[PDB]
């Protein structure tokens, strides 16, 4: 199937992404893990600050739409299935879910960049691989998941963004 | 909890703690995943050679002792396995993504130096600086939950020392 996240949602979808390997002694995230993990000062561009129940309209909706699952501790906690689950079709490498969590927490960004940002996701070798792991999402069959972007003036290297928001313009 | 795993047990639990952070794409394995895993000539200390019924043998004594889970869907018949050891629902032990970097390197790879435990255990998590590596193994030994990892008496020449887990039940000197 094909995704075009709201940018919120793909904030809820990068927020359990990111803890699942980052903090897994936390995973699966309660609703209030979520709204934390949201509503961060770091590593989140932009910064936002949602209501509980915003987020809890994203976590049922993204649950239907079968992206999440509720596990039952009276507290309940969620589970991603975006990737790697032991029936959806979408499979990632450790390096491309790091790479695709970073662009939705932190939007358009260049290969110097997802190199330290999700370094703690995966830590890349080289800056090699974060551009072969930024190519294969993009050259993939099952659509392209990356898509790069126009350079910026002054810069010598041009940004990367996901495909699960929709459109992409520049 | 009591610990009392056996060679065989694990190399087991720590090919799935692996597989689930390098290799989340396969994660959880089939029954002939945890063989590969097991018989892998890298990462290994020592290198085995066990076969699909011992392996199986072993992932159905750990699945009754609540230390992996069978996963079963409908329409596939080939069971994956994964992981009960640390940081599930039900269970008490938490391990941070260092600490159980670490301490699946030591189930894998037997008694390590920490310089030797980062260079191994960077792919299940990059360590800032050795002090990280030395400050998660001193949680470990330190954790009123029980000792996780000793440490042992330096070998002559060493300036450092080498760490062991406790899952295995009895370590000396």
Do not use: W
Request: charged letters at 30%; proline letters at 4%.
């Amino acid at each position: 199937m094909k995704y075009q996240l709201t940018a919120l949602e793909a904030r809820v979808i990068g927020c359990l992404l990111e803890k699942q390997v980052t903090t897994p002694e936390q995973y699966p995230l309660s609703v209030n893990g979520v709204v934390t993990a949201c509503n961060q000062k770091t590593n989140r561009e932009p910064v936002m600050n949602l209501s509980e129940s915003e987020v809890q309209e994203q976590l049922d909706n993204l649950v239907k739409r079968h992206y999440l699952r509720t596990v039952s501790g009276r507290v309940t906690k969620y589970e991603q299935r975006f990737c790697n689950s032991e029936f959806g079709d979408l499979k990632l490498s450790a390096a491309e879910v790091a790479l695709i969590t970073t662009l939705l927490l932190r939007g358009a960004q260049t290969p110097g960049e997802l190199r330290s940002r999700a370094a703690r996701m995966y830590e890349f070798s080289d800056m090699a691989e974060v551009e072969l792991t930024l190519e294969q999402l993009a050259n993939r069959e099952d659509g392209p998941f990356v898509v790069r972007l126009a350079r910026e003036p002054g810069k010598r290297e041009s940004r990367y963004m996901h495909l699960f928001s929709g459109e992409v313009e520049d």
